[PDB]
């Protein structure tokens, strides 16, 4: 069980840790988060009481180093930082725990929600989508644009998701125009799975990361990426049987977790209607169709 200590909380902020969130008051004696489960990536995220605009946060894996949060009064945000001195870090954490100024990552023992949302997500892959190579953790916020969004401006602060475009030479083989456009199996299986992602685990990892950036930061381009990667599978007639079974489980937990009040802007009506009712895979997502029909029958 790992710890992300906080130097202080000088400004009033809603703090998110994975799917949980807590209010901290201006200058409240808060020194961070303990009992964080090892074995998963985590995200710690922020929304200032005084500007509910710019949700921002840090993807990190406690196995990759000792990370803490310190408010920067110049840049006006809670910054993640690495302490390289292991012994100095243990001493700081030990003090704050003895004085009980830390909240406990509140994991219910029955609850596999975070594992199910992050099953295929790996810090090494996150660091290729979010390029800032001098840090072992990755910064994301509401306003960051995707490489594909920038094509249609600052490359350093972009989300480097895999570009998917159904009306692209990459997606359509010369002389197989109608076939490749109506059945995207070629694009899914040869171009994306065999060619770029190498396996379904890396494809699911990017899909899951895009969803979580959409849900936690309201990142519009992440939402576009999440829908594109669902639609590419649902619009393919030929998908490995294990991928369909795993996709149904992935989407079930994403829809289960989504705040009820955000379904109207985070869920694309056309994509879901097409995927559940029109597509080759319309009969292959039993769990996902049942939760969507019982929780959001309006969108359909």
């Amino acid at each position: 069980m790992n710890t992300v200590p906080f130097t202080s909380a000088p400004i009033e902020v809603t703090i998110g840790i994975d799917q949980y969130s807590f209010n901290v008051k201006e200058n409240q004696p808060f020194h961070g988060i303990k009992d964080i489960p090892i074995g998963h990536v985590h995200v710690i995220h922020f929304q200032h009481a005084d500007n509910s605009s710019m949700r921002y946060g840090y993807w990190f894996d406690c196995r990759m180093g000792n990370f803490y949060i310190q408010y920067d009064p110049k840049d006006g945000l809670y910054k993640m930082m690495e302490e390289r001195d292991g012994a100095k870090f243990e001493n700081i954490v030990h003090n704050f725990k003895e004085r009980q100024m830390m909240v406990s990552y509140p994991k219910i023992d029955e609850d596999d929600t975070w594992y199910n949302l992050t099953e295929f997500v790996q810090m090494d892959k996150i660091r290729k989508i979010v390029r800032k190579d001098e840090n072992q953790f990755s910064y994301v916020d509401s306003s960051m644009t995707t490489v594909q969004e920038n094509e249609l401006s600052d490359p350093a602060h972009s989300l480097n998701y895999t570009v998917i475009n159904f009306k692209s030479r990459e997606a359509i083989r010369p002389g197989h125009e109608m076939e490749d456009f109506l059945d995207k199996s070629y694009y899914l299986n040869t171009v994306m799975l065999q060619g770029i992602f190498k396996n379904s685990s890396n494809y699911f990892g990017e899909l899951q990361f895009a969803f979580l950036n959409a849900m936690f930061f309201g990142n519009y381009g992440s939402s576009l990426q999440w829908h594109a990667m669902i639609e590419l599978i649902c619009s393919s007639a030929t998908v490995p049987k294990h991928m369909l079974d795993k996709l149904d489980e992935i989407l079930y937990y994403q829809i289960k977790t989504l705040p009820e009040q955000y379904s109207d802007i985070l869920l694309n009506e056309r994509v879901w209607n097409i995927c559940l009712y029109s597509s080759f895979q319309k009969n292959s997502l039993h769990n996902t169709e049942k939760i969507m029909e019982n929780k959001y029958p309006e969108l359909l």
Partner: protein, 237 residues
């Protein structure tokens, strides 16, 4: 974006463009089988690809053999239309290639866009205009070459005959759309109006009769009367 009344004059500028109409590509007769079920028999079709400035018509004949052993023919027809238009553009020298293609029906946008990915600089556009190009098969000489074809064939026409010697392409296009609108609303009346006087003939190299300027006015007037009547009939007004 979409071609409408507000940007109508664009058709007659010096940027090469083509209209593509797919409404006569897949044509069937519906009939009863011996068992009393219903079946279709396909007949020859055509892609109507028109330069509205020059009058040059690229009439690609669609022979019934292209449908043999195919499923979902109404969907395949849109993709075959897109493949034939793409092939036509690639056959033209670069300085003859269109800068825009305007499809008369929105269901042609994705098939044509996907076929023309090699031509990112050619804009594929819908229109809000209700153009009567479906009536092309009421032009006797175009209907004749489609129905006689025994194989796939491209035939070149000038749908304005020699009108551009005397009128602008704006006026030639207005005359063509009035003639086709008439032929679409009441084919027999329209065709009676055009050929009633046997002193006016169709030249062997032309589609329409050799009317003087004065006789075109009279003809244009008869076509307008036919269209308004039938509209009063249709809508009891």
């Amino acid at each position: 974006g979409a071609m409408n009344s507000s940007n109508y004059a664009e058709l007659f500028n010096n940027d090469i463009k083509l209209f593509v109409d797919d409404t006569n590509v897949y044509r069937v007769t519906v009939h009863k089988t011996f068992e009393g079920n219903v079946a279709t028999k396909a007949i020859n079709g055509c892609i109507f690809t028109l330069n509205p400035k020059t009058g040059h018509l690229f009439l690609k004949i669609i022979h019934t053999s292209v449908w043999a052993g195919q499923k979902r023919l109404s969907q395949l027809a849109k993709w075959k239309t897109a493949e034939e238009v793409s092939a036509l553009v690639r056959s033209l020298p670069k300085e003859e290639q269109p800068k825009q293609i305007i499809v008369t029906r929105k269901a042609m946008l994705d098939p044509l866009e996907v076929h023309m990915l090699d031509f990112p600089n050619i804009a594929i556009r819908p229109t809000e205009l209700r153009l009567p190009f479906s009536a092309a098969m009421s032009i006797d000489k175009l209907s004749d070459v489609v129905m006689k074809a025994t194989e796939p064939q491209m035939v070149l026409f000038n749908i304005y005959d020699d009108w551009l010697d005397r009128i602008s392409s704006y006026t030639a296009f207005s005359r063509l759309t009035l003639l086709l609108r008439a032929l679409k609303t009441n084919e027999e009346s329209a065709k009676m109006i055009l050929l009633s006087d046997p002193t006016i003939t169709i030249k062997s190299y032309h589609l329409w009769p050799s009317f003087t300027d004065e006789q075109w006015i009279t003809i244009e007037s008869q076509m307008r009367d036919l269209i308004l009547t039938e509209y009063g009939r249709k809508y009891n007004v």
